Structures are given as C-alpha cells and as structure tokens.
A paper describes a structure:
Three DNA polymerases (Pols), α, δ, and ε replicate the genomic DNA in eukaryotes, with the latter two possessing the proofreading exonuclease activity required for high fidelity DNA synthesis. Mammalian Pol δ consists of a catalytic subunit and three regulatory subunits. The catalytic subunit (p125) harbours the polymerase and exonuclease activities, and a metal-binding C-terminal domain (CTD).
In addition, we present the structure of the Pol δ–DNA–PCNA–FEN1 complex at 4.0 Å resolution. To test this hypothesis, we reconstituted a complex comprising human Pol δ, P/T DNA and dTTP, PCNA, and FEN1, isolated the complex by gel filtration, and analyzed it by cryo-EM. We obtained a reconstruction at 4.0 Å resolution in which the mutual positions of Pol δ, DNA, and PCNA are analogous to those of the processive Pol δ holoenzyme while FEN1 fills the space between the N-terminal and palm domains of the p125 subunit, where the ssDNA template enters the active site, and the unoccupied PIP-box site on PCNA. Flexible-tethering of FEN1 to PCNA in the holoenzyme is suggested by the cryo-EM local resolution map showing lower resolution in the FEN1 region (6–9 Å). Rigid-body fitting positions FEN1 in an upright configuration that is different from the three conformers observed in the FEN1–PCNA crystal structure, but that can be obtained by rotation and translation of any of these conformers via the flexible hinge. Density corresponding to the cap-helical gateway of FEN1, which forms a hole through which the 5′ flap threads and is guided into the active site, is missing, suggesting that the cap-helical gateway is flexible and points outward from the polymerase. The reconstruction fitting a defined FEN1 conformer comprises ~20% of the particle dataset, while the reconstruction from the entire dataset shows no significant density at the FEN1 binding site, suggesting that FEN1 may be absent from the complex in a major subset of particles.
Numbering used by the authors:
A (entry chain H): 2 to 44, 60 to 102, 134 to 353
B (entry chain E): 1 to 186, 191 to 255
C (entry chain G): 1 to 186, 193 to 255
The structure:
Amino acid sequence: GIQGLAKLIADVAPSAIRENDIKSYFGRKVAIDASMSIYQFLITTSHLMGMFYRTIRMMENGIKPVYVFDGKPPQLKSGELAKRSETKQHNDECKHLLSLMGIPYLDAPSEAEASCAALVKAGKVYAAATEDMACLTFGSPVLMRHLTASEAKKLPIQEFHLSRILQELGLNQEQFVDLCILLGSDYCESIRGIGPKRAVDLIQKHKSIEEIVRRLDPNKYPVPENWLHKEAHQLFLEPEVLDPESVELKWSEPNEEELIKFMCGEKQFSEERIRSGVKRLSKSRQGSTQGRLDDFFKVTGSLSSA
Amino acid sequence: MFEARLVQGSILKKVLEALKDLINEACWDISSSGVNLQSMDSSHVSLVQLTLRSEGFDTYRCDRNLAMGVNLTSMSKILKCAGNEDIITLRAEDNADTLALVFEAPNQEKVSDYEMKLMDLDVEQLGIPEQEYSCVVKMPSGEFARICRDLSHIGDAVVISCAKDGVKFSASGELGNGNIKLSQTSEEEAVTIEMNEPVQLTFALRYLNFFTKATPLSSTVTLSMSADVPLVVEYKIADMGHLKYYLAPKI
Amino acid sequence: MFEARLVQGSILKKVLEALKDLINEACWDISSSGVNLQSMDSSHVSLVQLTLRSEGFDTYRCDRNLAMGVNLTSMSKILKCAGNEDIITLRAEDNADTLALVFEAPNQEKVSDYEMKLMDLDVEQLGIPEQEYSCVVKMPSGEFARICRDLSHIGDAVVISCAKDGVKFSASGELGNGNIKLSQTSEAVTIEMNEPVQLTFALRYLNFFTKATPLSSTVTLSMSADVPLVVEYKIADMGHLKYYLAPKI
C-alpha cells in the first residue's frame, strides 16, 4: 500500500482514526482482501485454519464478512521489476472452506482492494478490511485494520474515515491521490525530494504533482526516472473493479458434515475443536442491529462555540 | 450583552441533572427567540433539542446571536451549589468568553456569583425530519419511569406494540418473558394513546432510563413514534418551552 | 392444576425477605393444607421452617400435590415488582416446571405477569424434634433486634441466662464486656420457667434470623439446656416462621 501514510494521518488528522473494539462492529458487512488475508495467516494448513477461526470470530461479534480475491494484476512497481530481468492451489483451497461455511466470495477483475473500495462506496458493505491504506487512496470511505488479527494479539480494530482525512488535509480525493503517490505508492517510484509531512504541504498549495514538479526544479530535488506519476494517479481513481450492484452477497448456513468431512479428515486436525467451531459459527447467524440517527435525519452541520 | 433572569429557577437544575449523564458537552445557541440547544449523543443513537422561548422568562436583554459551548458536568457541579427556590441569573459578554452565574436568594441574604470559563466547539449538527407520528401517547412521567424501571430488571432492550385498545410493552430476559399492557383511561394523570395504524418497534430500555431522567420536568410526558423513525419523548417545560429527546430506532 | 390467590402479597415479599439473604435454594411443598418449607442452610446449623395454611388463603385449588425446587433469590427478585397493597396470584401446573405469577393491583390497570422456571433437586430434609421446653419467653421484636445487633458489636458470641425472675444476655470482646438483663412484667415480656439455664450462641446467625421482624409485632424464644433454641415469629392468621439454632458447647 501507501508508505508512512498511517503515521502521517495519526500525526496530522487523528480525528479520522478511531480505536474501537471488535464488538462495536456488530451488524456490519465488511469487504476483506482474501489475498493479503490468506497471506497473513501463512506468515501448511494455516491458509485455512486462520481462514477458519478468524472468520468465526468475525461472525461471533456480528460482523458479516465477504472475502475478496484478486484477478489479473496491473502495472505495479516492484511487480513488473523482474520482467526487467527476463500457487492458487492453497488459494482456492480457501474459496472452498468459505462457501462450505456459508460465506460469500468475489473474483475481483484485478486488484481486490480497489474492488473492496468499489463496494464500500456503493453501500453494499460497511468498510473494507485490509492492512494496506491503499483502499483509502482508491476512494473507500471506511477502512478497518486488524480485523483479521489473532484472537491473542489483543489489538483493537483501527478505523479510518476518508471523508475526514480529505477534510483536514483540505484536498479532494484526487488531490489526496497525488499525496499518496509522493508518500510512497507501490505502483510507481516516489520522489526522493519531499518528505512525509513535506509532501502534504506542497500538495496543499499545488493541487497536483504536475504543478509541484514545474515549481521546485533544481538538481537538489530531481524527479524520478520513468515516473508514471500519471498512470498511477489514474488507477487510484478509476480502477478495474466488478460493479457493486452486479451481485448480492448472502451468508448461508454452515454445512457441518460436508465441511468437517473436508477438514479434520481430508486435512487432518483436532476434531473436537473444528466441531465446536462449526457449532459456534452456526450460532452467530446475524449481526446488523440498532440504527443511527443519520439513518433518518440529514446532518445539518456543526455549531462551534464562540 | 446577554443578561437574563429566571425566578422559578429549579428547572435549570432539573434539566442539567437530566443532561449530564447522557452527554459531556452542549452547543448553546442563544438567539433572540431565547435559549436553544440541538446536540447529538455520544453513542450516535440519540439527540437533545432544548427550546426556551423568551416569553417563558422574566427579564431579558439579548443583543447577539451567541453560539457557545458548555462542558456540562462541571456546570452541573456548580449548579449543585444553589437551592431550588433560588433565582437563577445569567450574564455574558460577547468578548469575554466566560459565563457569570448569579444565584439570588428568595430572602435575598445569600448572594452567589460563580464563573465558568469557555472552551471552543465545532460540534456536528443534523436536522430532524417532520412527519406523521402514528402513535402519540400522553402519560404521567412518574408512572412511565416506574414502568420502564420495572422492565429494567428483566432484560435490556424493549419491544413495543402500539395499537388501538391497549399498548404492549414487552421484553425478554435471563428469567424469561414479560409484558405489561396499558389502555386509555376514561389533566396530568390522564393518559391518551392517539393512534391511526398499529405498529411494532424495537427500542433500547437503557436509553428509556436515560430519557426518564427528566421525570420531574413536566406535567405529562409525551411519547411520539411512527414506523422506523426516532422516538421523540417530550417534556413540556411548563410556561417556558419544551425539551425533546430523539432516539434513532433499532434494527 | 394448582392455583392460589393471596391478596396480602406484600407479606409474601417480606416472607421472601426472610430467606433471600439466609438461604438461596430450597424445595417447596404444596398440599391442600397450604405452603410448607423445611430447609437447611449452607453452614449446616439453622433449621428453617415456614408454614402458610390454606384456611387463611382467600382462594385455593390443589388437586395434585407438588414438591418443587426454587432458587429463593430470584423469586425474591421477581417478587419486588409490585407495590405494598397488591395481590399475588400463584399458579403452577401438575405437568409444567414453572410458577406463573400475576401481580394484580387493586386498581386493575397495571397488571404484571411472570413465568419462572423450576429445578428438581435432592436437598436433604430434617424434621422437627418435638420435645418440651424448660423456659419460654415472649418479648417485643424491635427491642430484640436492637439487642442482637448491639451485642454483635462487643464480641462474637452471646451467653444467655434465664432464671426465676429475669433474663440476661452477656458478651465479652476485645474492648471489655457487656450484659443486659430484663425483668418480668408484673409491649411486655413473659417468662414461663422450669429451670435457670445458661447457654452460648453465635450472633452471626442471630443477625441472619433477625430480618423477619416486620412480619410480626412480637417474638418468641423457646429453649432449655443441651438442646437447640427456637426463634419464633407469627404470620398473621396463616402460619409461622421458625429458626432453629443449636447452641455452642
């Protein structure tokens, strides 16, 4: 994702970040990045064990998950780097443990994270859950971090509100995009010049890198080699994502046998547990609850003390 | 230069006693219509609208549309230092960011003159919708508080069924199910369930305990509900104006 | 089908206020005679007996006989949802594991209803050893409550002594000693005696047995030597309430 972003925010607009408890998310439908998720568990039954437990915990608290997979990757920086020099096995093994638990899944046209955002900004889901701030760049209004952490690591989930970020940094999404790029995008090389906090300011009185470059120009702050500061700025805007409305996710009922006969058996693992597990998942069948006033009254604005 | 008086001044003690357990701050909008307060809750479920007209006051001088902010519980701790027969007076300068409270005595021998400093505010503000409320119930406030507290020892959230003959306050709990039925009674102790179409809704009983903190605040309590909308409980602050608590409904 | 109606329901609240700090779980016996409880406490000392007779019951129906098991705590909890002029309607079935309880106001406008579950149990029983008692005394209740509370402040036990003429309670503790005598009234007190007897009791469970004070106006103590003492209260025209404590040796 984007480099030093979380810190930048934390350090200049903490009002857009909250440290809530996993419980407060009861009734929320969230878009997850299966790829990264599946990875997190590894770093070989883990790609599914965590894909198991965690999703149970996410269910137990009322959170309704929708795992997402990536399709045909695009032009990522280090991505096509070895190309300057010239599997899905344990991946789909998950796209199974899911529907066998009654948990949705979607094949993103490319980068899931972008798709996740795609959803979130369509009311189809609450927030996007990844570890990479990218989602924010892609225009996602709400991003939840740590929702896939171990039951142990007592880390609370970290929420981020794009519309609050944009608020403080006084800059449109696009204007925010350039910031992420100059902050350290994983799509193109940043500019050795500007610093985390520095990069902000420039963007603040130069609503684009295109204007930031022509300004500072000495050989004291040179602009990258093959700088695609453009191509990127585009992706973060109009990515490749499956239409939101295209489908309706529906959490089904877990199939104890069919699944336990494809887990503790075919993949060998303590039966007693994966049984009480499927049991618990079956219990926590729901989440949505208590409405907000927003849900019925338009927000007037803000009264500020004299 | 804001300078206002209130002789039967126990109502201010009474409103801020029912304000401080809900919310930690308030956006005090002083207009020439009087003293107003729209403010959300802290849990993003509820809201307070306080309106105090000028004609419910005694003596009045408003020269500014003041928009200030009060930290509520320290102000309540200061309001705990005056009796209920005592006259409450407020003074405010539009450049001096402080509140000068003057507590007169009914025998005028004890004078109090307290001062609370100001803090800045950028509070959110949303507008309530105006609509048709399919059930408006006039009730005694003490009986209402008694009933919802009697339900508090069963479970946590309440289900309501509002219909023609009776109204049905039901709940579950760790000891099982229960429900109490009410009907109209054929000026303060009179009830009335005015109804067009029967409904069923879910609400939080703990927020009803929070809303019944204004039990001594009116003659009668009004309960206004419709389908999938914020319940508005109304305490008509007698001869003064009214306090309305909105509760966004549950799903 | 068992059904019962007691229009002095507040009494039963105080009846449950006799138990809800003293014993937590017990077994209830239901016959045509009325409601009966004969339970043991947790520290294996007090014999707790409660009788309500159905002659005082205003409306009764008991065809099949019941022996149920109740957590007395939560019954006292669900009994505290009615004012002090109300009516309790009890109803329990010969096949269902419940009590269906109807709080009925005299002004029948707010009526409360509850359905409490049951638990079949195996609490050991112990009956009343019927004997004589060499000394009986009948005294007012608030004065005895004051006496037991006060002697609990000096020491942890009480040595009582009765004779021809008066009665005496004594205790010795860390800051010295104290005693209080009473004299035979010639609101009042009575003694019928056969022998001047002295024994020793533990004031913790007198502070437990005290809480049945507003179910009566007076209180009876019946006792001898080398046998337990009986603290006795009267439920008005329906029954009575006994706490049996065996004295320290």
